Design a protein around this ligand. Structure first.
Ligand SMILES: [Mg+2]
Length: 67
RNA sequence: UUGCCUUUUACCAGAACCAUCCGGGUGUUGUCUCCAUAGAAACAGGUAAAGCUGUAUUUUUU
């Protein structure tokens, strides 16, 4: 259990870093700043995965406490 | 922080910080150079030349 805890923590940290980075990027993209074509694709990918995660979490929520 | 862009150098041109560099000033020492190269002149005056002053009838002195 302790290991599972620790890893859960560290991925939450990493996850936090990721999500915030993504958010920063998307504002940056909106602004129309210098940004790497590759970087923009990366951000698109991240934000998609993020969106899917959000979405299916909402599905879970819907299930877990009725319509 | 913007721009070109989009990958970095290289860059756009603004900011704030800072540094580098091309030079500069004096002052003092010292050297290098070109010229030099005297160990004593005044006083008494005269000569000539330079620095100031001078050319009584009510308050300065007639
Ligand atoms: Mg590469």
């Amino acid at each position: 259990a302790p290991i599972k805890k620790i890893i859960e923590r560290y991925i939450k940290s990493k996850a936090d870093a990721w999500v915030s980075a993504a958010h920063y990027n998307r504002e940056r993209i909106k602004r129309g700043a210098h940004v790497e074509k590759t970087m923009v694709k990366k951000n698109l990918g991240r934000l998609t995965r993020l969106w899917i995660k959000n979405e299916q979490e909402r599905q879970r929520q819907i299930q877990k406490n009725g319509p």
